[PDB]
Amino acid sequence: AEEQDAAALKQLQQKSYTPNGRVVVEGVGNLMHHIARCCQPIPGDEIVGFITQGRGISVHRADCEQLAELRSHAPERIVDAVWGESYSAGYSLVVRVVANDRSGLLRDITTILANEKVNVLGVASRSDTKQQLATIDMTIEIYNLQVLGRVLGKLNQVPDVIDARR
Amino acid sequence: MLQPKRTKFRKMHKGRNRGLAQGTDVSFGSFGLKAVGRGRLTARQIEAARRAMTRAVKRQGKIWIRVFPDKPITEKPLAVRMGKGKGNVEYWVALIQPGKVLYEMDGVPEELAREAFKLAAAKLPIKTTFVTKTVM
Amino acid sequence: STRNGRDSEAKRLGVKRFGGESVLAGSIIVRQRGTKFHAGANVGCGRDHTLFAKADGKVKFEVKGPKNRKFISIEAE
Amino acid sequence: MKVRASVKKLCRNCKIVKRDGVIRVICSAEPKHKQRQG
RNA sequence: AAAAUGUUCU
RNA sequence: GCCCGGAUAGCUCAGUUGGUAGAGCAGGGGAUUGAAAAUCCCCGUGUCCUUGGUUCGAUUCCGAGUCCGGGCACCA
RNA sequence: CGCGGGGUUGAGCAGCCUGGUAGCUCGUCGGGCUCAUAACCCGAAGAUCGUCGGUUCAAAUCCGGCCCCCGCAACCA
RNA sequence: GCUCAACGGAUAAAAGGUACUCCGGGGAUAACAGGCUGAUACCGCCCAAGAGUUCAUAUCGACGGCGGUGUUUGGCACCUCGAUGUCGGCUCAUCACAUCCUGGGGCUGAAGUAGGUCCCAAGGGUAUGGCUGUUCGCCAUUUAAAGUGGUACGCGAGCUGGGUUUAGAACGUCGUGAGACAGUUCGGUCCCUAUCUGCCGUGGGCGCUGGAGAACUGAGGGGGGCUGCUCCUAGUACGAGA
RNA sequence: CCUCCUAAAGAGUAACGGAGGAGCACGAAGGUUGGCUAAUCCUGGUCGGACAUCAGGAGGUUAGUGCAAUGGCAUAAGCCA
RNA sequence: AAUUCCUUGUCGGGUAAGUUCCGACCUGCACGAAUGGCGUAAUGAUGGCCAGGCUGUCUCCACCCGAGACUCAGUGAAAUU
RNA sequence: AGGACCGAACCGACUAAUGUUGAAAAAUUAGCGGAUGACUUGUGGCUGGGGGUGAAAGGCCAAUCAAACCGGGAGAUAGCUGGUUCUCCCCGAAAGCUAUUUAGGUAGCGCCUCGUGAAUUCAUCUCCGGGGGUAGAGCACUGUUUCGGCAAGGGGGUCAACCCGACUUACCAACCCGAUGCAAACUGCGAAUACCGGAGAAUGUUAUCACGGGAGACACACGGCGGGUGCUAACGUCCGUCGUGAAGAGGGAAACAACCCAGACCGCCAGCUAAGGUCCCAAAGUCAUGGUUAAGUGGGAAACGAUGUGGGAAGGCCCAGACAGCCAGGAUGUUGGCUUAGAAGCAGCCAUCAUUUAAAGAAAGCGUAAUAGCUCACUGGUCGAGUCGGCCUGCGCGGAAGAU
Ligand SMILES: [Mg+2]
Ligand SMILES: [Mg+2]
Ligand SMILES: [Mg+2]
Ligand SMILES: [Mg+2]
Ligand SMILES: [Mg+2]
Ligand SMILES: [Mg+2]
Ligand SMILES: [Mg+2]
Ligand SMILES: [Mg+2]
Ligand SMILES: [Mg+2]
Ligand SMILES: [Mg+2]
Ligand SMILES: [Mg+2]
Ligand SMILES: [Mg+2]
Ligand SMILES: [Mg+2]
Ligand SMILES: [Mg+2]
Ligand SMILES: [Mg+2]
Ligand SMILES: [Mg+2]
Ligand SMILES: [Mg+2]
Ligand SMILES: [Mg+2]
Ligand SMILES: [Mg+2]
Ligand SMILES: [Mg+2]
Ligand SMILES: [Mg+2]
Ligand SMILES: [Mg+2]
Ligand SMILES: [Mg+2]
Ligand SMILES: [Mg+2]
Ligand SMILES: [Mg+2]
Ligand SMILES: [Mg+2]
Ligand SMILES: [Mg+2]
Ligand SMILES: [Mg+2]
Ligand SMILES: [Mg+2]
Ligand SMILES: [Mg+2]
Ligand SMILES: [Mg+2]
Ligand SMILES: [Mg+2]
Ligand SMILES: [Mg+2]
Ligand SMILES: [Mg+2]
Ligand SMILES: [Mg+2]
Ligand SMILES: [Mg+2]
Ligand SMILES: [Mg+2]
Ligand SMILES: [Mg+2]
Ligand SMILES: [Mg+2]
Ligand SMILES: [Mg+2]
Ligand SMILES: [Mg+2]
Ligand SMILES: [Mg+2]
Ligand SMILES: [Mg+2]
Ligand SMILES: [Mg+2]
Ligand SMILES: [Mg+2]
Ligand SMILES: [Mg+2]
Ligand SMILES: [Mg+2]
Ligand SMILES: [Mg+2]
Ligand SMILES: [Mg+2]
Ligand SMILES: [Mg+2]
Ligand SMILES: [Mg+2]
Ligand SMILES: [Mg+2]
Ligand SMILES: [Mg+2]
Ligand SMILES: [Mg+2]
Ligand SMILES: [Mg+2]
Ligand SMILES: [Mg+2]
Ligand SMILES: [Mg+2]
Ligand SMILES: [Mg+2]
Ligand SMILES: [Mg+2]
Ligand SMILES: [Mg+2]
Ligand SMILES: [Mg+2]
Ligand SMILES: [Mg+2]
Ligand SMILES: [Mg+2]
Ligand SMILES: [Mg+2]
Ligand SMILES: [Mg+2]
Ligand SMILES: [Mg+2]
Ligand SMILES: [Mg+2]
Ligand SMILES: [Mg+2]
Ligand SMILES: [Mg+2]
Ligand SMILES: [Mg+2]
Ligand SMILES: [Zn+2]
Ligand SMILES: [Zn+2]
């Protein structure tokens, strides 16, 4: 019960929280852009931007499926690039965390997510009926790949978590 | 817990549990937990067994639950006399004869599977033996 | 407190005269709800599908037709 | 002394033995592990 | 016939 | 004499054999008034008692001295 | 868990009353009156009718179950 | 022409109370206790997910499983309605062990002291009060400990009769009302001279082979079996100290 | 009072066993003669939509029976005249 | 509360400790104004509680004196079976 | 003065004890209340039974009171309880159904009996004619059920956001296909039995049916098999069918209506057998042959536990030396990398190779802050016979604590 309460509190906190050097596309900075949710690049192994009709460019992360499809369809809108100067904030990590649902696992996970210097923008949550598998996607904001890795490691360390990835 | 989502009838007769099973072979998986002992597996028990075996395997390889608790077992509350109609459905059971494969399992080593089924067996009220996917 | 105390009086359906049973004309061979038995030769199907003898003789059950239905005939002997 | 219905070799150094018709795990390596059937 | 009230300190 | 406990934003308290600290109030700063209350917004705004040690890294663990709160012993 | 009654717009009540028409008062919102808030005036929005099944042509309505409520009787030794 | 629907239709035409009750019955049927049962209860054990820094198993023990006991709440209605007296207290107890203390021991997350848990062990012991009818409980202060059960929830031909459970009266409540309430309140007859068993005592008769008086033996039976504190060992072992 | 099951393959068969219905309706919803064949699904097509009506194919009684259920029903007992 | 189930309500008093008593709260299951309400001196073989005194009520029984009980003599029942 | 005070007589009756077959059908003793009053008491009177009287309790009205007593109606009525008296012989039930202001009563039918009549009537079995839709089975149907397939239809997201609609995606996902179960109220199947009809044989005292007289009974019980209910609890409960008891003794089951065996006309100091037994109590094997247990199992119990012990076919290592002890090694690239704070076989993650090799895992457990260290697998000797571990079943062990 206590665990549940804690989890609830964490969720509430998250909700409350929720409430241009970044990407230099092809040797010309300050281009209207945005990270795509299909797969969200931070310091990723190269990126590629699809020049959209509206809302400028959509950055996809290099070797993406959607990006590949786009290329196949029409290569001329696509532009390869560098990940600029590393934007001060450098937001956008969605972290999918699969875990075995006992009475007080989700709460624990939430707790572990907190304390670490991570801005929790959103928390999607559900228990899968295929077993009793708690699965959760935390939309979080953080400043580096190393930091992300560390966070992942921390998450793993809570033994009830089966696997944690993007 | 395993339970029929919908039914024709809420209350079922006791019946009897004589005979052997039809679900006798390890149809789907590689290994099987075959009920030697006659009885009735409640839904809860089955669930427990599943938990034990899944846990044991560590979600490596697939597991089947051949028996389904489709029969509603009623009870009367305490300080209630014998008349006044048939009692309410407290839980659901699967009548297990000798032969019924209860769980099948693949995607694991044999030893591991056996271990899992030991744990599973502990949970269950009926005597159970390990079996394999026989050719024909 | 139940709400299932009810049941009807049993109507005594079924076969009154069986295979090779000698019947007088008028004798009910079968009582039934449907034409679970159909009227064969020298057998009448009453308004409640009661099969009765239209002649004196031995009762004779027989599956007939494409639908494979039980016809009760009477073999005039 | 544990005294169980079920006595088991809890390690490799645990040794089952019947004394006065009583199954007993006795272990050199760990005296916690020593058991009895009762 | 019916028409209540006016945040504090300047 | 000896021990044990406690010493964290202004101030109430939260977090401990180790991962850069929060909740309330209070405060700020804006809109706005003469300034306020109200209303509307936005915000940690900290010598974790000082000094050393241990460590790949200390609020926390070991000292070392302080301070307070105990609980013990002591009869010139 | 035995007998009835109820769960409807933010609140309270009607409707159910024998399926097919969502109404009344207060509140809310937008105007107006005023110096300004009241009161008053005008206009407006609002409801998967506890939930889940079911019966149906169709359910708020009929029926079942479950969730919460309100009565209630729970005794004689 | 009858929701004569209690539907083989008692009349055209009919509801309650009784603790003021009465008669005839019933253990065909309840309350009491016994019996059978064991859902529940309590006590065990099986699995071991975890917790326990590490480590399932010192201690815990999820999800589940299997038993025992008869021991709570119940089920059944077999015993008793030509009476088997009910709760509690008192007085005497007696057995069981599932031991609370005392004795022995294993493991310990056992340094010592103190504990925890498990095994064995029933010899003896095993609280006075306050409140309440209470058992129980809570509280006070003890105690080595304040065991848990059985015994007609032991024991009313032993006592009590505070409670429940007649007749009076009242309150609250429901009932139009008589009245009614595991609601309350005040008041309210507890009989028996022991035949038999049993038991505690205590004699007579005969026997034990001739008798009598003594003294014995001891088959067997009973009783008894509790424990504190203080001091020494030694402020020694142990412990960084306490 | 009726339907099923309980009911142990004739009938029958209890329980304060488990399920639902009836206390009618219809002068056509009866009689007969002639004819017709369903639910659903796909593709298409005025408003027309997941759902009205019309094309054809698949479908083959899944439907219908004035109402409960069971047994029946294409020779239709179903639906038209 | 002669009323209050939940309930030994909570708080205070009284006690070493108070399900009773007194006082107070008000959340009156379900008080209430002539089937009267709330007060009330006096009264009561009235109910409840406390205190002093007093005590074999008790700790925890002891002895003693008488009437029975026991033995003898006389008379001589009873329920029950 | 006073329904004033205290307190005798007098009236009363609060407490206690006694007594309860009493001294007494309400008293005694000790106390206790009133004791000039609505007091008390004598004598006589009046009030009468649904009537009186009642400072009200249903109190009192002659030891009697929610309707006095006595007599009569009157032998009220009693579906209830009890009881119902000599003998022998034959037959011999029921505790069911249906209805019942009925449920413990009663009525008709079923069964019992006595009587008369009647057919090859009935029963047994054998061959034929049948209908079943239960057991079982099955899953096309009704539902339900797990998995795999391809997948409309939703959801997410990427193109685009007015859309067309395109792409896809470890999201869900109906229909359809393949495999899997389950069902009292499912059946594209389907027994045994039972039931009905026929023919035939022997048997059987007509055993069958009809009518008529007389009933009884309509509380059943346990045992078996099939179920419902309950908890696949009850000597529970309600049904079906047979048995027994009821109404049935004898023998066995220690004792034990209903279990087993077996139907007592009488008698016998004859014999044979049934169940069950055969060392002694206690009638008969201390019988025979081959095995098993060792627990007093037998002579009470489960999950689970365990080199308990027997039997079976089959398998791996085995005098190219096993298994177990005993003696050594158990290395190099190497700190594999990576990921971490560190990780050097051993927080973990990922490759998991080769080399020198007799053999040595990028390491199975312990161990460190990590190294180190200590065992292991694997290896060679040492040693000289089998050993290892399933799975089969037999019997056993623990699990296994209660009260005289
Ligand atoms: Mg020994
Ligand atoms: Mg009487
Ligand atoms: Mg009797
Ligand atoms: Mg009883
Ligand atoms: Mg008992
Ligand atoms: Mg009992
Ligand atoms: Mg009885
Ligand atoms: Mg009975
Ligand atoms: Mg009698
Ligand atoms: Mg008697
Ligand atoms: Mg013991
Ligand atoms: Mg003793
Ligand atoms: Mg001794
Ligand atoms: Mg006490
Ligand atoms: Mg008693
Ligand atoms: Mg008593
Ligand atoms: Mg007695
Ligand atoms: Mg009393
Ligand atoms: Mg009274
Ligand atoms: Mg007495
Ligand atoms: Mg002795
Ligand atoms: Mg039948
Ligand atoms: Mg049958
Ligand atoms: Mg269309
Ligand atoms: Mg009240
Ligand atoms: Mg009270
Ligand atoms: Mg006192
Ligand atoms: Mg108090
Ligand atoms: Mg007192
Ligand atoms: Mg008071
Ligand atoms: Mg009043
Ligand atoms: Mg008034
Ligand atoms: Mg009044
Ligand atoms: Mg008054
Ligand atoms: Mg007076
Ligand atoms: Mg004398
Ligand atoms: Mg006076
Ligand atoms: Mg007088
Ligand atoms: Mg008087
Ligand atoms: Mg008295
Ligand atoms: Mg006198
Ligand atoms: Mg006197
Ligand atoms: Mg006086
Ligand atoms: Mg006179
Ligand atoms: Mg008269
Ligand atoms: Mg008269
Ligand atoms: Mg009265
Ligand atoms: Mg009268
Ligand atoms: Mg007369
Ligand atoms: Mg008479
Ligand atoms: Mg005879
Ligand atoms: Mg009847
Ligand atoms: Mg006759
Ligand atoms: Mg005759
Ligand atoms: Mg079947
Ligand atoms: Mg009767
Ligand atoms: Mg009967
Ligand atoms: Mg009966
Ligand atoms: Mg019967
Ligand atoms: Mg039977
Ligand atoms: Mg019975
Ligand atoms: Mg019979
Ligand atoms: Mg006999
Ligand atoms: Mg006998
Ligand atoms: Mg016996
Ligand atoms: Mg005998
Ligand atoms: Mg024999
Ligand atoms: Mg002999
Ligand atoms: Mg011999
Ligand atoms: Mg055993
Ligand atoms: Zn992308
Ligand atoms: Zn060990």
Swiss-Prot record, chain A:
Domain ACT: 94-166
Gene null: resulting phenotype: A slight increase in biofilm formation in a csrA-disrupted background; when combined with a spoT disruption (a ppGpp0 mutant) there is a very large increase in biofilm formation. The ppGpp0 mutant makes decreased levels of CsrA and its inhibitory small RNAs (sRNA) CsrB and CsrC. Deletion of relA alone decreases persister cell formation in a hipA7 mutant; the double relA/spoT deletion obviates persister cell formation.
Signal peptide (UniProt feature, chain positions): none
Disulphide bonds in the chain: none
Role: In eubacteria ppGpp (guanosine 3'-diphosphate 5'-diphosphate) is a mediator of the stringent response which coordinates a variety of cellular activities in response to changes in nutritional abundance. This enzyme catalyzes the formation of pppGpp which is then hydrolyzed to form ppGpp. The second messengers ppGpp and c-di-GMP together control biofilm formation in response to translational stress; ppGpp represses biofilm formation while c-di-GMP induces it.
Similarity comment text for this entry: Belongs to the RelA/SpoT family.
Protein name: GTP pyrophosphokinase
Curated annotation (Swiss-Prot), chain B:
CDD domains linked: Ribosomal_L16_L10e
Cited Gene3D superfamilies: Ribosomal protein L10e/L16
The keyword Ribonucleoprotein belongs to this UniProt entry's keyword annotation: yes
Pfam families referenced in this protein's UniProt entry, alphabetically: Ribosomal_L16
GO MF annotations, alphabetized: rRNA binding; structural constituent of ribosome; tRNA binding
Superkingdom field: Bacteria
Similarity section: Belongs to the universal ribosomal protein uL16 family.
Protein name according to UniProt: Large ribosomal subunit protein uL16
Source organism of this protein record: Escherichia coli (strain K12)
Swiss-Prot record, chain C:
Record protein name field: Large ribosomal subunit protein bL27
Molecular-function annotations in GO: ribosome binding; rRNA binding; structural constituent of ribosome; tRNA binding
Taxonomic classification: Bacteria, Pseudomonadati, Pseudomonadota, Gammaproteobacteria, Enterobacterales
Domain of life: Bacteria
GO-annotated biological processes: assembly of large subunit precursor of preribosome; cytoplasmic translation; cytosolic ribosome assembly; positive regulation of ribosome biogenesis; regulation of cell growth; ribosomal large subunit assembly
Record keywords, A-Z: Ribonucleoprotein, Ribosomal protein, RNA-binding, rRNA-binding, tRNA-binding
One annotated Gene Ontology cellular component of this protein: cytosolic large ribosomal subunit
SS bonds (residue pairs): none
Record's keyword annotation contains Ribosomal protein: yes
Residue segments, region Disordered: 1-12
Subunit note: Part of the 50S ribosomal subunit. Cross-links to the 23S rRNA. Cross-links to the A and P site tRNAs.
Assigned protein family: Belongs to the bacterial ribosomal protein bL27 family.
Organism annotation: Escherichia coli (strain K12)
Swiss-Prot record, chain D:
Signal sequence range: none
The keyword Iron belongs to this UniProt entry's keyword annotation: no
A GO molecular-function annotation: structural constituent of ribosome
Recorded GO CC terms: cytoplasm; cytosolic large ribosomal subunit
Sequence similarity: Belongs to the bacterial ribosomal protein bL36 family.
Any Pfam family hit: Ribosomal_L36
UniProt-recorded name of the protein: Large ribosomal subunit protein bL36A
Function: One of the last ribosomal proteins to be assembled in the 50S subunit, it contacts a number of helices in the 23S rRNA, acting as molecular glue. The simultaneous presence of uL16 and bL36 probably triggers ObgE's GTPase activity and eventual dissociation from the mature 50S ribosomal subunit.
Presence of keyword Ribonucleoprotein: yes
Keyword terms, alphabetized: Ribonucleoprotein, Ribosomal protein, RNA-binding, rRNA-binding
Gene encoding the protein: rpmJ
InterPro entries: Ribosomal_bL36, Ribosomal_bL36_sp
One Gene Ontology term from the biological process aspect of the record: translation
Subunit structure: Part of the 50S ribosomal subunit.
Highest taxon listed in the record's lineage: Bacteria
